[PDB]
Amino acid sequence: AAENWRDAMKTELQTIRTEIQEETARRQEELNAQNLVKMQELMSNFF
């Protein structure tokens, strides 16, 4: 029963980890896109 409880905690910890990893990947891709806009902004903002 203790082992079954451990397994139940494990499968949910995996779902939470995958959801966090997928959200992180999406947010960091968006950050790269924003950094490029912010650099193209800052460059033309000088000249």
Numbering used by the authors: 129 to 175
Paper text:
Overall, these findings led us to conclude that the segment between residues 125–265 contains two independently folded domains and encompasses all structured elements of SAS-5.
Native crystals of SAS-5CC diffracted to 1.8 Å resolution, whilst phases for structure solution were determined by single anomalous dispersion (SAD) using trimethyl lead acetate derivatized crystals. SEC-MALS analysis of a slightly longer coiled-coil construct (SAS-5CC-L, residues 101–206) demonstrated formation of a trimer in solution in a concentration-dependent manner, with apparent Kd of ∼3 μM. Both the crystallographic model and MD simulations show a series of hydrophobic residues (W133, M137, L141, I144, I148, L159, M167 and M171) forming the core of the coiled coil and enabling trimer formation. Interestingly, we found that all these residues are conserved or conservatively substituted in SAS-5 homologs in other Caenorhabditis species, suggesting functional relevance. Taken together, these data support the notion that the SAS-5 coiled coil promotes the association of protein dimers towards higher-order assemblies. We found that the thermal unfolding profile of a SAS-52–265 L141E mutant showed a reduction in stability of the coiled coil by approximately 25°C, whereas stability of the Implico domain was not affected. Substituting an additional core hydrophobic residue of the coiled coil (SAS-52–265 L141E/M167E) effectively abrogated coiled coil formation, again with no effect on the Implico domain. As anticipated, coiled coil disruptions in either SAS-52–265 L141E or L141E/M167E mutants yielded a stable dimer in SEC-MALS experiments, mediated by the Implico domain.
